[PDB]
Design an enzyme around this catalytic site. Structure first.
Site, PDB file in Angstrom:
ATOM      1  N   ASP A  46      -5.565  34.381 -19.568  1.00 41.19           N
ATOM      2  CA  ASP A  46      -5.519  33.450 -20.703  1.00 41.19           C
ATOM      3  C   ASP A  46      -4.379  33.794 -21.688  1.00 41.19           C
ATOM      4  OD1 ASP A  46      -7.072  31.216 -20.474  1.00 41.19           O
ATOM      5  OD2 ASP A  46      -8.856  31.974 -21.544  1.00 41.19           O
ATOM      6  N   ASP A 335     -26.978  27.836 -27.052  1.00 43.32           N
ATOM      7  CA  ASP A 335     -27.092  29.282 -26.924  1.00 43.32           C
ATOM      8  C   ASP A 335     -26.357  29.786 -25.669  1.00 43.32           C
ATOM      9  OD1 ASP A 335     -28.578  29.249 -29.236  1.00 43.32           O
ATOM     10  OD2 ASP A 335     -30.519  29.585 -28.252  1.00 43.32           O
TER      11      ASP A 335
END
Ligand SMILES: [Mn+2]
Length: 354
Positions: A46, A335
């Protein structure tokens, strides 16, 4: 029988994720006791860091020596740094065996490997101004970290040159998804999703395994042991064919790191063209395949094109990716941004390593 496995490693910053540790994880993957053809290693970078790219190139070149060595003498662990730290009993031999000379050679060539990695790190430790230039002569596409095209590079595999014993090694794919101002990338999550798609285009293995860049494989047989469960103290396992309504496991299951799991569970699909998956004919085709794989008719190049297309920047717009498909983008309620979403709907299997 042994099904193809796609293994994902995500890295972001060479300065908090030391290239050598990543190298050791990758080397543990490339030396895995499993048919070379059916194991593939995808490394998302990334950070688009040339330090990482070059470290990966170096790693593959060393793998050419390290892998046949490990397979020949049944070495474990098959991550060099931790192997060479295990003390050996040299005293038990009357004379040097062929193993120990092979091995002293090997350790020497690994120490050399480390030296060149350190060299890459240090060289990187202060920015050139006109940007980094490749060993080629052409500028490095990742220099502008938040603004750069998609990059994919395949090492090893069928046309990356043999190991020291004339045998082929697993694919080792570098992937750096497109980054542009104005598009979110959802961090590791958007990265996992892009890797799902790229792997689907290039190999399309029925199973996926996500390892952290520091999680080296302890036991070269890990994949075989996993297959001993996936196809007909202790570790995490999960199996479910879910016809049904109220009986059994209800709803989705979320799988994180260190777990081999079946690919198609990601995809929805009750037993239409609809671009729920974004617009790539090749990719949805891949999702509609029985036991994985690519059409051999396709040539390595034009599928490299569509693989670059599925990591473009805005591919996911107007698609379920991150919403109901793949790794789930968070800060709303769910979550997650903690795992791959496996839909209840169909066949699901997980085998996790200790
Ligand atoms: Mn998005």
């Amino acid at each position: 029988q042994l099904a193809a496995v796609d293994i994902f490693v995500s890295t972001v910053d060479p300065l908090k994720e030391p290239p050598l540790v990543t190298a050791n994880t990758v080397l543990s993957i490339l030396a895995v006791d499993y048919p070379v053809d059916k194991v593939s290693c995808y490394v998302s970078d990334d950070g688009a860091a040339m330090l990482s790219f070059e470290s990966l190139a170096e790693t593959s070149e060393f793998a050419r020596k390290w892998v046949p060595f490990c397979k020949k003498y049944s070495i474990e662990p098959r991550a060099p740094e931790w192997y060479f730290a295990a003390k050996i009993d040299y005293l038990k031999d009357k004379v040097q065996t062929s193993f120990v000379k092979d091995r002293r050679a090997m350790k020497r060539e690994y120490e050399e490997f480390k030296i060149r990695i350190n060299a890459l790190v240090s060289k990187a430790l202060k920015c050139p101004e006109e940007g980094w230039v490749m060993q080629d002569g052409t500028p490095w596409p990742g220099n502008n970290t938040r603004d750069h095209p998609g990059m994919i590079q395949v090492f090893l595999g069928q046309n990356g040159g043999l190991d020291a014993e004339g045998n082929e090694l697993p694919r080792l794919v570098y992937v750096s998804r497109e980054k542009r101002p104005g598009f979110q990338h959802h961090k590791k999550a958007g990265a996992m999703n892009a890797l799902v798609r790229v792997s689907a285009v290039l190999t399309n293995g029925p199973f996926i395994l996500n390892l952290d860049c520091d999680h080296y494989i302890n036991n070269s047989k890990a994949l075989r042991e996993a297959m001993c469960f996936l196809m007909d103290n202790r570790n995490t396992v999960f199996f479910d064919i879910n016809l049904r309504g109220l009986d059994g496991i209800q709803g989705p299951v979320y799988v994180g790191t260190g777990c081999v799991f079946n690919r198609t569970a990601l995809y929805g699909y009750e037993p239409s063209l609809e671009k729920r998956f974004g617009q790539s004919a090749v990719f949805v085709a891949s999702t509609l395949m029985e036991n994985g794989g690519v059409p051999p008719s396709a040539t390595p190049e034009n599928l490299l094109k569509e693989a670059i297309h599925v990591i473009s920047c805005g591919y996911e717009d107007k698609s379920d990716w991150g919403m109901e498909i793949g790794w789930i983008y968070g800060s709303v309620t769910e979550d997650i941004l903690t795992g791959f979403k496996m839909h209840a709907r169909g066949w699901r299997s997980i085998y996790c390593m200790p």
